[PDB]
Amino acid sequence: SRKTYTLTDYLKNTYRLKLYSLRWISDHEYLYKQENNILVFNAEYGNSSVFLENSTFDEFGHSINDYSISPDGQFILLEYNYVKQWRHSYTASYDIYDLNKRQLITEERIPNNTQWVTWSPVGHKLAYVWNNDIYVKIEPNLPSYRITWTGKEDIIYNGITDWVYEEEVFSAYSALWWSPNGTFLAYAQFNDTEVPLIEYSFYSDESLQYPKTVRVPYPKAGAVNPTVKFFVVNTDSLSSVTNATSIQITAPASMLIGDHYLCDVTWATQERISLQWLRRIQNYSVMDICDYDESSGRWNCLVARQHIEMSTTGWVGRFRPSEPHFTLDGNSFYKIISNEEGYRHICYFQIDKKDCTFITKGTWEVIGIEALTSDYLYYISNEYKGMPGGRNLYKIQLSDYTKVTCLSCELNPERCQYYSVSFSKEAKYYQLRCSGPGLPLYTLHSSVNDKGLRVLEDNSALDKMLQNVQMPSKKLDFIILNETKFWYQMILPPHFDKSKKYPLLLDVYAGPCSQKADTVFRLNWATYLASTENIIVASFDGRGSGYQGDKIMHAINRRLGTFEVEDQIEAARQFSKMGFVDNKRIAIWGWSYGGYVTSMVLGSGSGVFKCGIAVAPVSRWEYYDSVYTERYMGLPTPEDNLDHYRNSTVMSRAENFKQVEYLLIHGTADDNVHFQQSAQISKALVDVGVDFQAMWYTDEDHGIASSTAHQHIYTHMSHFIKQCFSLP
Amino acid sequence: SRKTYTLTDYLKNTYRLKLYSLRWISDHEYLYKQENNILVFNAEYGNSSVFLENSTFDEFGHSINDYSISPDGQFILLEYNYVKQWRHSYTASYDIYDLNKRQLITEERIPNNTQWVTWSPVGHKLAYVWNNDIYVKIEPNLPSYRITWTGKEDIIYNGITDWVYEEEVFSAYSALWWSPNGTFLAYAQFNDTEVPLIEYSFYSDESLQYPKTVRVPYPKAGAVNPTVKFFVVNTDSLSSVTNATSIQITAPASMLIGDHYLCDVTWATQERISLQWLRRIQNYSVMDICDYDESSGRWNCLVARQHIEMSTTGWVGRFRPSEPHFTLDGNSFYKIISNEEGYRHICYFQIDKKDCTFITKGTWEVIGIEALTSDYLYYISNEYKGMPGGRNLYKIQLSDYTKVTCLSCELNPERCQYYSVSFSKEAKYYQLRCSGPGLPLYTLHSSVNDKGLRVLEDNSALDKMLQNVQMPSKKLDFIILNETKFWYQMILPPHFDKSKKYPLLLDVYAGPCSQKADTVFRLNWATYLASTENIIVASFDGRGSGYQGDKIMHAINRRLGTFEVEDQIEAARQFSKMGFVDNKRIAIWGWSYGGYVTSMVLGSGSGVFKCGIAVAPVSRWEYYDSVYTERYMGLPTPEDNLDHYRNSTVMSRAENFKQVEYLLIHGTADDNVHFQQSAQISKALVDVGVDFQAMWYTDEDHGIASSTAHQHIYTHMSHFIKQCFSLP
Ligand SMILES: N[C@@H](CCNC(=O)c1ccc(-c2cccc(C(F)(F)F)c2)cc1)Cc1cc(F)c(F)cc1F
Numbered sequence A, B: 001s002r003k004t005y006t007l008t009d010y011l012k013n014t015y016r017l018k019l020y021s022l023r024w025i026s027d028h029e030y031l032y033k034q035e036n037n038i039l040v041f042n043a044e045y046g047n048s049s050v051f052l053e054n055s056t057f058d059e060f061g062h063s064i065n066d067y068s069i070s071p072d073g074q075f076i077l078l079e080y081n082y083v084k085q086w087r088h089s090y091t092a093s094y095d096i097y098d099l100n101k102r103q104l105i106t107e108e109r110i111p112n113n114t115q116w117v118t119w120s121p122v123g124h125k126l127a128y129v130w131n132n133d134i135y136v137k138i139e140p141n142l143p144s145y146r147i148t149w150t151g152k153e154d155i156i157y158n159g160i161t162d163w164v165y166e167e168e169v170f171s172a173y174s175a176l177w178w179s180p181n182g183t184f185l186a187y188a189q190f191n192d193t194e195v196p197l198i199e200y201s202f203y204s205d206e207s208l209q210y211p212k213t214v215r216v217p218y219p220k221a222g223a224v225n226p227t228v229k230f231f232v233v234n235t236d237s238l239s240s241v242t243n244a245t246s247i248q249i250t251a252p253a254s255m256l257i258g259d260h261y262l263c264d265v266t267w268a269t270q271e272r273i274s275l276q277w278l279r280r281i282q283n284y285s286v287m288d289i290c291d292y293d294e295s296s297g298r299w300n301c302l303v304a305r306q307h308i309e310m311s312t313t314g315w316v317g318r319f320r321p322s323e324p325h326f327t328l329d330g331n332s333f334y335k336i337i338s339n340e341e342g343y344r345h346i347c348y349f350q351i352d353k354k355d356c357t358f359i360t361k362g363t364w365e366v367i368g369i370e371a372l373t374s375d376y377l378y379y380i381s382n383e384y385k386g387m388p389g390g391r392n393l394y395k396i397q398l399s400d401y402t403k404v405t406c407l408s409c410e411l412n413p414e415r416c417q418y419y420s421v422s423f424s425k426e427a428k429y430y431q432l433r434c435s436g437p438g439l440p441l442y443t444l445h446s447s448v449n450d451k452g453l454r455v456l457e458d459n460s461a462l463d464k465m466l467q468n469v470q471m472p473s474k475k476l477d478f479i480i481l482n483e484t485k486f487w488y489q490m491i492l493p494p495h496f497d498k499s500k501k502y503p504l505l506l507d508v509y510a511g512p513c514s515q516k517a518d519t520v521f522r523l524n525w526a527t528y529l530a531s532t533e534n535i536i537v538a539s540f541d542g543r544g545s546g547y548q549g550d551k552i553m554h555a556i557n558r559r560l561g562t563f564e565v566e567d568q569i570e571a572a573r574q575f576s577k578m579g580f581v582d583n584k585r586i587a588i589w590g591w592s593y594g595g596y597v598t599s600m601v602l603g604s605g606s607g608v609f610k611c612g613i614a615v616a617p618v619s620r621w622e623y624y625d626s627v628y629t630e631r632y633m634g635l636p637t638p639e640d641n642l643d644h645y646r647n648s649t650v651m652s653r654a655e656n657f658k659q660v661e662y663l664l665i666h667g668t669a670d671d672n673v674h675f676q677q678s679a680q681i682s683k684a685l686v687d688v689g690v691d692f693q694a695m696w697y698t699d700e701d702h703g704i705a706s707s708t709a710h711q712h713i714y715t716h717m718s719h720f721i722k723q724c725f726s727l728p
C-alpha cells in the first residue's frame, strides 16, 4: 500500500468508525435513528419500520440537539439550545410533543435555561430543575408544582450536583431519582455557602472589551467542602396549592460526627431506597436502607440493615463504592466489593445479614453488574485468558453459583476481546458492543437462546478503506517486575523490523485505577505517529493501575507522585532492553493526570528521556479538588499527610529539567486543572533558568476540545516530536 | 581581540556603565553617595567632605530603600519597606531623623503603607498620602492634621493619581504641589466611581492555594473615565481642632461642557498657580492662572488671562501640553508650543496677552526648558548638525533673543552628542550628562564662566575592558523617502564587511513621538547579537516619530496601525537595497507598542520578513487605555473613528501569519497591556490554523523585569532568533 495514516487523516477524520446507538423502550422494542428517521426495530420478529419520519420537524423552527421519548410511548421531549457547562452539566431549552395527537404543546412550557429534565421511569411525569429548584409536572400542560424554594446560584443546588459532585462522585449534573413507580422524587441538596471560589479569566469574542471573570465553587485539597442533605417527596399527593413536604432522610450517626459525602442512591422497591455515605477520609463507607412508613409519612433506616464498606490498604471503591442490584422483592442485593485477597468480585447480601457471600472468586475482577433476572445475573469481567486488558459478558445461574457461562469469549476470539452490553427491559434481549482488537462489531442477541440473531454493524466499510492504508499493528503483552506481571501495549509501525532501532514515544496516564493497555481498537494520534513517522508509541500499567486487584491499585495509596512515576521510567528501560528502541530517542507525553506524571518523570533526572509534552498537568496536589485528591492523599496537614503532599510537586523538580526538552500546554479556562497549576511550573522553571516551550489556549478547558484548537494542539505537538526526534 | 560581548555579558552585567547621581540642596552644594557615605561636594571651592558617615545606620534595623533630606538641612526622611505598585507608584514605610540633634524620632510617626510623602520645598513640613487621604505635618513630631476625609480605595484618590493618570498624564503617583513658600498644598481628587475594572489572576508563591484576582480601575478606549476636582489648602493657618477648608478651583467653562482631564499644575508665585486642562478629545487645551484673594480666601482665575492651546493637524503636546516657566515676578512665562510651521519651539507669553512671541525658530525642536535666570533661559535641543538624534544644552539671552550660545556642542564632538543637564538652585552651577555616542561622560560647570571645572565620571574603567572586546559599531544615517529625511540606526557587527551579506534584525518601537535612532551609547541585547552572532540590528524612525515636527509626528493621527507599520516594512526594503543584507533572513521584533507594530508587519504579508517576536503587544486599540488610545484615535464610535479602530487589529491579519514564524510573549500580570491583548491574537491564529510559538510569564508585568524572567526571556528570544537564522 502506497498511502499512510496521516496527521490530516486523524484531524479531519478521514476514516470513520461506525457505531450502532440503540435505545430500548420495551422488553423487545428499541430505537435506531437514520438520516433523521427514528425507526423502531422489533427484535422479536424483525417487522420493524417507521416510528417518526425524518421530516416531522423540518418546520420545528430550531436545530434539535437531543430527544427523550416518555417510557409510556406517549410523548417526545425536544432538547434544543444546548450550552455546555462542565463535563456533564449544561443548560438547554425544551418543547414537548404529543405523539398520540400529532401536535406540539404551547401551554405551560418548560422554561429556557433548564438545568436538568427527566421522565418518570414509567408513565409521563416530568421532573425538571431550573434556577436550582426542582419542579414537577404530572401532565405535559398542567402547571408545575414547585418542590424546592431554596435554590440560590452557586450556593444552593436542589436536584443537581455542584462542580465537585458532578465531576468526582456522580458523573452527572443530576441529583434526582425516581422510584421505579413514579411516586417518589428523591433528590439531594448541596450547600456551597463556605466553599471557596476558583477565579479565572474568560476572554470571549474579540468584541468583548473587558474580560469576564468566572467564579466557581471549587474545594481544593483540605478546603471547606460542600455539605449535603437528602430528601424524598411524593409526586401523586401534590396539591396545586400547598408547598410540598419533602421528607429529609438524615445520614447515619457514624457519618454526622464529621465531614462526609453522599456517594450513591439506588432504589430497591416502590417504597425502599438505598444510600451509601462516605467519610471525608474515604476508607470508610456505610449503606442505609430506608422504608416508607405508610401510616407515618416518615422514612425509617433500620440500624440493623446497614452495611459497612471499608479498606485498611486503601480507599473504598474504584473511584466510589459500587452500586447495589436488588432482586424483585427487594430483600437482598448483589454488589461488587473487594474480597479478602483484594479482588473486586460480586458479593451477595441479605438486607439484614452483616456478611455477604462471594458468588465469584479468583485472580481477576468483575467490571460491572449489568442485569439481574429471576434466573441469572449478568456481568462483565476481565477473566478470559488471564487478560485484564479484556472485557467479556458472563452469566451466572442464581439457583447455582458454579454455572458460569461466558456469552462472548468465543464469538470472534481474533476480532473481539473487549465487549460491553446493552440489555432490553426484563433483560429479554441484548446488544454486544465489541471494541477491539479488530474493528468495532455491533451484534444483537436473545437471552433465552443465546443465539446471535442479527449483525447490526460490522464496519466492513471502514475495513475496505483500511486495506489500502499501511496500518500500525498492536502488541499487548506483560513483563514481570517482582513476582508481579505488568501489562503494556505497543503500537508498532507498519512492517515492523525487530532488528532496527525505532524511536519510542511513551504515552502516559498512570492515574489511580488507570488502564492504558487494553485490547481496544483506536484511531488516534498514536496511529498517525506509528504509521507515518515510524514511532513506536508505548503505554504501561504500573502500580496504582486498576482491574488487577487492590495490591497493585492501592500500592500508590498516600504516595501519589511516586511508584506510578517510577514504574513509568522503569518501563522505558525495559523497552530499550528489547532490541528495537533507539535509546537516544525516548520521549514521554500525557494529559491531565498523565501530564503530571510526564512532568515528574522529566524532573526525575533519570536521563532516560530526551523530550516530553505535558498537557493540562497537575503540578501540586494542593491545587486539585478535595474529593479526588484526598481520596489518595488524605489531608494536607502535618498531623495527616502534608509531607508526601509537599514532596510530590513538579516545581520542586525544576532544576532537573535542565536535562530535557519540555513542552507545556494549558487551556486558559480550564475549570478543572486550573491554569494555575501550569503557571506555577512555568514560574519554577523560570526561577531556575531552565528553557522550555509553552503554549496556552485561550478560553479552552481541560479538553482543549474545540475543533480549531484540537487541530492546533495536535499539530503543534507533532512538530515538537518530529523536531525532537529529527524527522524530515 | 579574542573575546566577544556575549549573552551572559548582557544578562549578568559583565560591563557596568558608571553614572554620577547628584542632588543639589543649595545654589552651590550638592550630594554624592559613596560606599553608603553621603558626602556634600562644594562646587565653589572643592573643600567637600562628610555629611553623613556610612555607618550612621548600621544599627537602624531595616534595609534602607531611599532617603530625603529636608531643604532646610535639618532632617532626613528614611524610606524603607518598598513595595511596587504600577510604573511609578508604590507603598512604603518611613522614619524621620533629626540631623541637628543626632536622634531618630519616635513619636507621632509616619504610618506604614504610605502612598506618598514629600518635604515642603523650603522649610521642613511634610505632606503625606495614606489611605487616599492627605495629611500635613508642620513639625516631625507634632500630630498630623487630616486635610481630606473622602479617600476610598480604588474610588477616591486624594493627592495621588489613579492608574490612568499615573501612566498617561503625570508620570507620578503624586498629585501634590507645594507653593514655593510652603503655604499652600495644591492637590487633585480623582473619582473612579464608574470606571470599569480590569480583572486578572495573580498566582503568587507556590503556597497560595487559590490564585488571587487583581482588580484595577482602568478605562479602555471610550469607557467611562475618572473625573477630577482640584483644591488648594493653607498649611500655616491650620487649627489642630477644625477640619481644614480646601478651596476648590473649578475648571473653565469650555471644559465643563464635557469630558476633560487635568493635564498640568505649575505654580507661578507664592499666590499664583497655573493649571492646564485638556478635553477628552485632546486637540483642545486651556490654561488657567489663578490668584489668591487675600481678603476673600477664594481663588480667582481671570478669564482674560487664559491661554488656549490647540491643534488642527493633531493632538496638543508631545504626549501632553508642556509645562510653563515663570519669571521671578510671575507676570510672564515661557513654554514650548508648536509653531506655525509645526516645530516645537519656545514661545514667550505675558499673563494677559493672547499672542506669545517665538524666541526660537527653525527646522528642529526644543526638547525642554531647563532653567530660567534674570539673564538667561537654558534649553535642550536637537538643532546641532541638523540631527534630531542629538541632544544639546543651549543658552539664550533674555535681554536679546539672537544671543544663542551652545554650551555643549563643542566640548567633545566625537564622544558627546547626547547631553542632558542638572542645574543648581538659582542656576549657579550645572552638571552635563553626556550619553553617547561615546561612553557616558559626567562633568561639572559654572554658569557665570561656562568653564569646565571638574570631570566627575569618565567611565575610562569601562573603556579599559572594552578594548579587550570586539565591540559593534553604530552607523546613524538618513534615507530620503519623499522630500522627507527619515533617520535610521544600525548596530554593525565587529569588522563589518560591506560586500558580505549579513542577516538583519529590525528592532521596532514606532509609536507616536517615538525615537529609536539616536546618538546614545547602549549595552543591550542588540550588542550581543551584532558582536557575537553577526547580526545587523536596525531601527528606523518613520512617520508618527517625534522631534522632527508635527508633519512627521501627526502623520499618524487617527490612523494608528498604518503609515508607521508601512514605513517599517519600507525601511527593511531599503536596507536590502544596500548590499550587506541577506534578504532571505530579515527578522522583526518589538515590545509594547513595538510588539504591535511587529505583529502588524508580520500580518502584512509583505513576505519581506521571515520571523518575528512580539513582546507584550497591543492587538486591538479598544483594549488599551482611553487617555493614550484616544489621543491618537479619538472615540471608538461610528460617528467618530470606530472604523480605523476596527480596521487596525492584529487579529484581522491572522491569515497572513501562515507566511511567517512567530513568537508571542506576554507577562500574565500585565496591568498595562493586559494579557487579554495577546490572548486574543493567539485565539485568532488558532482559528485560522496558523502555527506559532508562545511563551507566557507567570506574575509578570509589562516590564518582564524580574531578574530571573528578564534573563529567561532574552535567552528564549536569542534561541528563537538563532534558530530562525540558522546559527550554530
Ligand atoms: N476528575 C477525575 C475524575 C475521576 N472519576 C472518574 O473517572 C469516575 C468514573 C466513574 C464513576 C462512577 C460513576 C457512577 C457509578 C460508579 C460506580 F459504579 F459506583 F463505580 C462510578 C466515578 C468517578 C479525573 C481527573 C484526574 C486528574 F488527576 C486530573 F488531573 C484531572 C481529572 F479529570
Ligand SMILES: N[C@@H](CCNC(=O)c1ccc(-c2cccc(C(F)(F)F)c2)cc1)Cc1cc(F)c(F)cc1F
Residues within 6 Å of the ligand: B167, B168, B169, B170, B171, B317, B318, B319, B320, B321, B322, B323, B511, B592, B593, B617, B618, B624, B628, B672, B673
Ligand atoms: N503609556 C505610554 C506612555 C509613554 N510616555 C508618555 O505618555 C509620557 C507622558 C507624559 C510625559 C510627561 C510628563 C510630565 C510632563 C510632561 C511635559 F509637560 F510635557 F513636559 C510630559 C512624558 C511621557 C507607553 C505605552 C504605549 C503603548 F502603546 C503601550 F501598548 C504600552 C505603553 F506603556
